[PDB]
Amino acid sequence: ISMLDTLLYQSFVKDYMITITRLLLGLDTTPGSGYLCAMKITEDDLWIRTYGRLFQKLCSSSAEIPIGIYRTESH
């Protein structure tokens, strides 16, 4: 719970910060809004190698924008 306590302290400088956080979470969903999804890069998706070229296919075909990536290395 203490990890997102920082959210409220950041909200002083940034008024938007609370509203934009809840739109990502999918609580305060307005009509023109988005949501977080998870596209797993399988053996078929290795066709694309870089994150820059992944940005092309997602943006051009289905109008999606990526925030980041979640890796699972063997170690």
Binding site: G26, L27, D28, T29
Partner: protein, 54 residues
């Protein structure tokens, strides 16, 4: 069973955010929510007996 998109009728608190959530067509009874004791509707004791896809 089919699903219908709609805002959930009973919000447990006042200042709550309404959203479309794939609601059930029929409003289910309180007995069918429980797994442990299979009531006169779908007598299943454990969760594996339901046969959950995904």
């Amino acid at each position: 069973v089919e699903y219908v998109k709609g805002y959930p009728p009973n919000s447990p608190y006042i200042g709550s955010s309404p959203t479309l959530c794939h609601l059930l067509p029929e409003k289910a009874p309180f007995c069918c929510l429980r797994l442990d004791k299979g009531c006169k509707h779908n007598s299943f004791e454990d969760a594996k007996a339901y046969g959950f896809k995904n």
